């Protein structure tokens with residue numbers, strides 16, 4: 001088929017199908033985060049221009065990494081237990097009267113996109129610049145279709161497509177907009 | 182391109198190119214396995230027919246899981262540090278006079294092959310039984326030539342294709358055969 005089809009299905013079968021159903025239970029186990037995270041869903045970032053996947057907290061004074069959730073073991077694999085954990089980001093929306101509104105979100109990048117970037121940049125590449133950009137669009141569209149039909153992931157994810165370079169400061173405003181309604 | 186081509190490059194950039202340069206260093210840090218492991222390389226299992234990987238020690242009395250190496254923390258496209266840990270297996274070859282020769286290998290399955298099986302398994306599958314089998318062969322071919330041209334991985338890996346259904350008892354014989362070569 002396509003290069004993106006494998007990456008989107010690998011992203012789902014090897015990760016999203018495993019951690020999204022466990023997401024509400026991980027937050028309940030964390031006595032420090034159980035009351036801080038109101039939106040118990042994984043906000044997946046889908047960068048379209050840049051693929052370095054830089055830390056979002058470095059591009060916004062309102063975004064601050066405040067630690068990780070307790071790790072959990074996923075039995076999916078071959079005679080090897082893998083461990084996953086989620087990082088929690090604190091979003092503090094300021095107001096002109098000095099008051100604040102504090103939020104907490106589970107935000108992660110779509111790591112398979114970083115693999116699409118690694119294929120094209122090195123010499124003797126599998127894909128050129130134009131051939132990779134098409135796979136990036138197909139990846140975003142395919143990952144949406146997979147999660148839209150997955151019944152065990154319904155209501156436990158959000159897809160945020162954006163140009164992952166100069167507008168990382170837009171993440172904080174998008175997360176709060178999805179939280180309010 | 183192909184489904185297998187993407188999974189092969191993903192497995193290379195997302196895992197092999199990360200843990201194979203760290204494998205030599207990670208073994209020497211384990212005070213328990215630094216001298217017990219004389220094959221400082223990763224043995225990648227490539228099942229062709231059966232993909233229910235199950236466990237390798239349950240199909241062979243000469244194979245036994247005996248712990249892990251110290252884990253490696255790597256930032257992989259995120260603020261967090263993902264855990265990359267290898268499992269050490271004990272392989273004791275019996276002899277008719279009561280003596281034994283005990284080896285220790287680092288062997289694990291190629292994870293993308295599990296995703297290919299998962300694609301064709303569930304309903305509304307993109308891959309059929311025939312299309313999956315073709316992509317499994319292309320994946321093995323592609324992963325071989327990628328690792329053959331990699332300077333960061335030269336001498337740090339071995340590829341072991343096998344059926345996977347009942348050939349799980351053959352893995353212990355192949356590992357000792359590859360060790361006796363070197």
Ligand SMILES: *O[P@@]1(=O)OC[C@H]2O[C@@H](n3cnc4c(N)ncnc43)[C@H](O)[C@@H]2OP(=O)(O)OC[C@H]2O[C@@H](n3ccc(=O)[nH]c3=O)[C@H](O1)[C@@H]2O
Nearest residue numbers: 010011014015083084085111112191192195196265292293
């Ligand atoms: O283990 P895989 O099945 O993961 C596939 C794919 O899902 C995402 N993923 C999985 N676990 C994750 C955690 N704990 N945090 C964040 N993201 C996670 C990854 O995007 C992963 O793709 P990749 O770019 O990370 O790696 C490529 C390729 O290598 C395999 N792999 C990775 C780590 C490992 O310890 N063992 C292993 O075999 C991946 O399979 C993937 O096929």
